[PDB]
Design an enzyme around this catalytic site. Structure first.
Site, PDB file in Angstrom:
ATOM      1  N   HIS A 102      48.646  56.447 -36.702  1.00 23.50           N
ATOM      2  CA  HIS A 102      48.919  56.263 -38.126  1.00 23.50           C
ATOM      3  C   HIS A 102      47.750  55.669 -38.900  1.00 23.50           C
ATOM      4  O   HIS A 102      47.738  55.761 -40.131  1.00 23.50           O
ATOM      5  CB  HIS A 102      50.125  55.343 -38.333  1.00 23.50           C
ATOM      6  CG  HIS A 102      51.450  55.994 -38.092  1.00 23.50           C
ATOM      7  ND1 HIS A 102      52.478  55.350 -37.432  1.00 23.50           N
ATOM      8  CD2 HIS A 102      51.944  57.197 -38.477  1.00 23.50           C
ATOM      9  CE1 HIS A 102      53.538  56.141 -37.395  1.00 23.50           C
ATOM     10  NE2 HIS A 102      53.237  57.273 -38.011  1.00 23.50           N
ATOM     11  N   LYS A 104      44.804  54.800 -41.113  1.00 17.40           N
ATOM     12  CA  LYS A 104      44.069  55.484 -42.175  1.00 17.40           C
ATOM     13  C   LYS A 104      42.787  54.716 -42.488  1.00 17.40           C
ATOM     14  O   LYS A 104      42.831  53.627 -43.075  1.00 17.40           O
ATOM     15  CB  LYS A 104      44.936  55.625 -43.427  1.00 17.40           C
ATOM     16  CG  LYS A 104      45.989  56.708 -43.298  1.00 17.40           C
ATOM     17  CD  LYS A 104      47.367  56.137 -43.208  1.00 17.40           C
ATOM     18  CE  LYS A 104      48.382  57.252 -42.933  1.00 17.40           C
ATOM     19  NZ  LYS A 104      49.504  56.638 -42.194  1.00 17.40           N
ATOM     20  N   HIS A 326      54.079  54.804 -50.502  1.00 14.98           N
ATOM     21  CA  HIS A 326      53.649  55.073 -49.141  1.00 14.98           C
ATOM     22  C   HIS A 326      52.681  53.998 -48.667  1.00 14.98           C
ATOM     23  O   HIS A 326      52.320  53.976 -47.485  1.00 14.98           O
ATOM     24  CB  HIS A 326      53.023  56.480 -49.052  1.00 14.98           C
ATOM     25  CG  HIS A 326      52.712  56.940 -47.657  1.00 14.98           C
ATOM     26  ND1 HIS A 326      51.443  56.870 -47.124  1.00 14.98           N
ATOM     27  CD2 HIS A 326      53.492  57.501 -46.700  1.00 14.98           C
ATOM     28  CE1 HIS A 326      51.450  57.373 -45.900  1.00 14.98           C
ATOM     29  NE2 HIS A 326      52.683  57.752 -45.611  1.00 14.98           N
ATOM     30  N   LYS A 328      52.103  50.177 -47.441  1.00 20.23           N
ATOM     31  CA  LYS A 328      52.895  49.161 -46.754  1.00 20.23           C
ATOM     32  C   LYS A 328      52.212  47.824 -46.995  1.00 20.23           C
ATOM     33  O   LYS A 328      50.986  47.726 -46.854  1.00 20.23           O
ATOM     34  CB  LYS A 328      53.012  49.415 -45.244  1.00 20.23           C
ATOM     35  CG  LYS A 328      53.708  50.716 -44.873  1.00 20.23           C
ATOM     36  CD  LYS A 328      52.742  51.904 -44.964  1.00 20.23           C
ATOM     37  CE  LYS A 328      53.355  53.130 -44.265  1.00 20.23           C
ATOM     38  NZ  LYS A 328      52.880  54.390 -44.878  1.00 20.23           N
TER      39      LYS A 328
HETATM   40  O1  LIG Z   1      56.436  53.950 -37.462  1.00 18.40           O
HETATM   41  C1  LIG Z   1      56.740  54.980 -38.151  1.00 18.40           C
HETATM   42  O2  LIG Z   1      56.642  54.966 -39.404  1.00 18.40           O
HETATM   43  C2  LIG Z   1      57.252  56.261 -37.488  1.00 18.40           C
HETATM   44  C3  LIG Z   1      57.100  56.457 -36.125  1.00 18.40           C
HETATM   45  N1  LIG Z   1      57.543  57.565 -35.517  1.00 18.40           N
HETATM   46  C4  LIG Z   1      58.158  58.519 -36.232  1.00 18.40           C
HETATM   47  C5  LIG Z   1      58.612  59.661 -35.585  1.00 18.40           C
HETATM   48  S1  LIG Z   1      58.359  59.817 -33.791  1.00 18.40           S
HETATM   49  O3  LIG Z   1      58.679  61.178 -33.349  1.00 18.40           O
HETATM   50  O4  LIG Z   1      56.942  59.719 -33.425  1.00 18.40           O
HETATM   51  F1  LIG Z   1      59.226  58.702 -33.008  1.00 18.40           F
HETATM   52  C6  LIG Z   1      59.251  60.667 -36.299  1.00 18.40           C
HETATM   53  C7  LIG Z   1      59.435  60.529 -37.669  1.00 18.40           C
HETATM   54  C8  LIG Z   1      58.976  59.386 -38.314  1.00 18.40           C
HETATM   55  C9  LIG Z   1      58.340  58.382 -37.599  1.00 18.40           C
HETATM   56  C10 LIG Z   1      57.882  57.241 -38.214  1.00 18.40           C
HETATM   57  O5  LIG Z   1      58.025  57.119 -39.381  1.00 18.40           O
HETATM   58  S1  LIG Z   2      55.177  60.973 -37.703  1.00 23.55           S
HETATM   59  O1  LIG Z   2      54.911  59.619 -37.237  1.00 23.55           O
HETATM   60  O2  LIG Z   2      56.148  61.504 -36.746  1.00 23.55           O
HETATM   61  C1  LIG Z   2      55.823  61.056 -39.384  1.00 23.55           C
HETATM   62  C2  LIG Z   2      56.523  62.198 -39.730  1.00 23.55           C
HETATM   63  C3  LIG Z   2      57.039  62.331 -41.008  1.00 23.55           C
HETATM   64  C4  LIG Z   2      56.848  61.318 -41.937  1.00 23.55           C
HETATM   65  C5  LIG Z   2      56.126  60.163 -41.592  1.00 23.55           C
HETATM   66  C6  LIG Z   2      55.946  59.143 -42.542  1.00 23.55           C
HETATM   67  O3  LIG Z   2      56.391  59.259 -43.648  1.00 23.55           O
HETATM   68  C7  LIG Z   2      55.231  58.015 -42.164  1.00 23.55           C
HETATM   69  C8  LIG Z   2      55.017  56.893 -43.178  1.00 23.55           C
HETATM   70  O4  LIG Z   2      54.235  55.924 -42.942  1.00 23.55           O
HETATM   71  O5  LIG Z   2      55.642  56.969 -44.268  1.00 23.55           O
HETATM   72  C9  LIG Z   2      54.733  57.935 -40.864  1.00 23.55           C
HETATM   73  N1  LIG Z   2      54.938  58.913 -39.984  1.00 23.55           N
HETATM   74  C10 LIG Z   2      55.611  60.022 -40.327  1.00 23.55           C
END
Ligand SMILES: O=C(O)c1c[nH]c2c(S(=O)(=O)F)cccc2c1=O
Ligand SMILES: *S(=O)(=O)c1cccc2c(=O)c(C(=O)O)c[nH]c12
Ligand SMILES: *S(=O)(=O)c1cccc2c(=O)c(C(=O)O)c[nH]c12
Length: 435
Positions: A102, A104, A326, A328
Site C-alpha cells: 500500500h 505511496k 482516501h 489516512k
Molecule cells: O488495509 C486495507 O486497507 C486493505 C487490506 N486488504 C484488502 C483486501 S485483501 O484481499 O488483500 F485482504 C481486499 C479489499 C480491501 C482491502 C483493504 O482495504
Molecule cells: S487492495 O488492498 O486489495 C484494495 C482493493 C480495493 C480498494 C482498496 C482501497 O480502497 C484501499 C484504501 O486505502 O482505501 C486499499 N486497498 C484496496
C-alpha cells in the site's frame, strides 16, 4: 510553511481551496527539479496516465514501479508497462497471506539533488480528481560534497530509517536507490518515518514498524501533559479491517495503547472518522467513491460494537466535505480540539494487517503489508504543541484538513459498506449502487 503538508487538488472546489494544493503534474514539474530518474511506490497504477503526468522532456527518464501484484495481476501491470522501454518493475515480496503493498512514495532523483514524496494517492486519474488526499514534500536534498565527512542524517533519523524501510524489500533495484540516498544530505528533514513491512518482529525489532514504531517515537520524543487522559485520539481512514468481537481484542488493547503514549513515564476518548453512506451518496464522485472505501458487510456485521465510535467526514475548513477521503490521518488533539500533540499522515487504514497485531504471548508483532507515513512532532519544530487550523477565524497553525470536533453519526446514518446495494436515493450523478 514548515510542515510541507499538502492536499491534492480537487476538481470542482472554488480556487481558494486549491491554491495551496498540489496536482501530480505540479510535483513532477521541472520547477521542482531536473529529473534524471524516479521510483514510484504504489498499489494501483495506470501506466499510460502516469507517464503523461511527467513533463514531456522527462518522459523517457528511467522509472521504477514498486508494486505488490502477483500472478495475472502482475501480468497485467507488465503489459501496461511494456510499451515504455524506460519503465522497470520491482515486485515487493509478500510472504504473509493477505498482504498488500500500500505504500505511496516517490523518489525523485534530480540533477540538483534528491526529493522524497510520501503521499496517499494511487497512480490513477480518479485518485487525484475529486478525493481528499495528503502529500508530504521533502526538501530538495543536496548531494554530500566530496571529502566532506557528513552522515547527512537528521535529528529525526529519517535517512537511516528510510534506508531501513527500503532494505526490507531485499530488492536489487531498491539497493540502487539506497546507494543514491547515501550520497545525499537529508539533515533538514523534520518528520519521523513510520513504516510497516511484512514480517514477525521480536525483541528489538518490535519497535521498528507499525503501531509499536509509533509508540516508541511518542515515548521518546513527545512529553505527557497533565490531564493527558482527557486529550482524545482521532483516527481517520478509508478502510476498516476485521478488529475482533469487541474493542478489547485489538482496538483499545494494543492499538489505542500505542496511540495514547506520551513521554517515558507511566478513559481517553476515541474518535474514528469514516464516511457514512450519506457522505458517499452526496459526494462529488457519488456512489463510485465507495469503490475506494472497502468495508465488507461480512466484516461489519461481526463488529457492530465499532460503529458507536464512528464520526462523519466533514471538511468545511478545506472546502472538501464532498471530496471523499482516501487520505489516512491520526492525531492527538487537546480536549477543546484547539491544539494537537502530534499528527500522522499515512497509507495505513484501521486494520491489523497495516498496523500490526501482537502474537506469541505479546512478544511478536506480525504485519502483513507495506505501509508508510510521516509523523509531525512539535519538538521536531521547537514547539510544545501545534495550534490547529480551522475554518473560522476571529482575526500560523498546523493545517488539519478536516473539521474539529468530529461529528458523531446520526441515528439514521450507517457506515459506508461497499458490497451491499443502495437503491433508496440517487447520488450526485443520478445513479444507484448495485454491487
Ligand atoms: O488495509 C486495507 O486497507 C486493505 C487490506 N486488504 C484488502 C483486501 S485483501 O484481499 O488483500 F485482504 C481486499 C479489499 C480491501 C482491502 C483493504 O482495504
Ligand atoms: S487492495 O488492498 O486489495 C484494495 C482493493 C480495493 C480498494 C482498496 C482501497 O480502497 C484501499 C484504501 O486505502 O482505501 C486499499 N486497498 C484496496
Ligand atoms: S577527509 O577529509 O578525507 C578526513 C579528514 C580527517 C580525517 C579523516 C579520517 O580519519 C578518515 C578515516 O577513514 O578514518 C577519513 N577521512 C578523513
Amino acid at each position: 510553511n514548515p510542515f510541507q503538508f499538502y492536499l491534492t487538488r480537487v476538481s470542482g472546489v472554488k480556487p481558494k481551496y486549491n491554491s495551496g494544493a498540489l496536482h501530480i503534474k505540479d510535483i513532477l514539474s521541472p520547477l521542482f527539479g531536473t529529473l534524471v530518474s524516479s521510483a514510484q511506490f504504489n498499489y494501483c497504477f495506470d501506466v499510460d496516465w502516469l507517464v503523461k503526468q511527467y513533463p514531456p522532456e522527462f518522459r523517457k527518464k528511467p522509472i521504477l514501479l514498486v508494486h505488490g501484484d502477483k500472478r495475472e495481476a502482475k501480468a497485467h501491470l507488465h503489459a501496461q508497462a511494456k510499451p515504455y522501454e524506460n519503465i522497470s518493475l520491482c515486485q515487493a515480496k509478500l510472504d504473509i497471506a493477505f498482504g498488500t503493498h500500500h505504500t505511496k512514495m516517490m523518489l525523485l532523483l534530480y540533477e540538483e539533488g534528491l526529493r522524497v514524496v510520501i503521499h496517499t494517492s494511487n497512480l490513477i486519474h480518479a485518485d487525484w480528481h475529486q478525493k481528499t488526499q495528503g502529500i508530504w514534500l521533502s526538501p530538495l536534498y543536496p548531494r554530500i560534497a566530496d571529502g566532506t565527512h557528513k552522515s547527512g542524517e537528521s535529528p529525526t533519523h529519517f535517512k537511516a530509517d528510510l534506508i531501513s524501510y527500503l532494505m526490507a524489500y531485499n530488492a536489487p533495484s531498491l539497493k540502487e536507490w539506497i546507494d543514491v540516498i547515501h550520497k545525499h544530505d537529508l539533515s533538514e528533514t523534520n518528520v519521523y518515518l513510520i513504516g510497516s513491512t511484512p514480517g514477525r518482529f521480536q525483541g528489538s525489532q518490535k519497535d521498528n514498524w507499525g503501531h509499536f514504531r509509533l509508540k516508541k517515537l511518542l515515548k521518546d520524543h513527545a512529553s505527557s501533559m497533565p490531564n493527558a487522559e482527557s486529550w482524545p485520539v482521532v483516527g481517520q481512514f478509508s478502510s476498516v479491517g476485521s478488529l475482533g468481537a469487541d474493542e478489547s481484542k485489538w482496538l483499545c488493547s494494543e492499538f489505542k495503547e500505542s496511540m495514547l503514549t506520551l513521554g517515558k513515564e507511566s478513559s481517553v476518548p476515541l474518535y474514528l472518522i469514516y464516511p457514512s453512506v450519506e457522505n458517499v451518496r452526496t459526494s462529488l464522485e457519488g456512489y463510485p467513491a465507495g469503490g475506494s472505501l472497502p468495508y465488507s458487510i461480512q466484516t461489519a456485521e461481526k463488529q457492530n460494537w465499532l460503529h458507536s465510535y464512528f464520526h462523519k467526514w466533514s471538511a468545511e475548513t478545506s472546502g472538501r466535505s464532498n471530496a471523499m477521503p482516501h487520505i489516512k490521518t491520526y492525531m492527538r488533539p487537546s480536549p477543546d480540539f484547539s491544539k494537537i500533540a502530534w499528527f500522522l499522515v499515512t497509507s495505513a487504514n484501521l486494520s491489523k494487517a497495516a498496523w500490526g497485531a501482537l502474537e506469541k504471548n505479546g512478544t511478536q508483532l506480525m504485519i502483513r503489508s507495506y505501509e508508510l507515513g510521516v509523523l509531525f512532532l512539535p519538538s521536531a519544530f521547537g514547539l510544545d504543541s501545534f495550534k490547529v487550523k480551522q475554518k473560522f477565524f476571529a482575526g500560523a497553525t498546523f493545517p488539519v484538513p478536516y473539521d474539529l470536533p468530529p461529528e458523531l453519526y446520526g441515528s439514521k446514518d450507517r457506515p459506508w459498506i461497499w458490497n451491499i446495494p443502495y437503491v433508496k436515493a440517487p447520488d450526485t450523478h443520478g445513479n444507484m449502487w448495485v454491487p
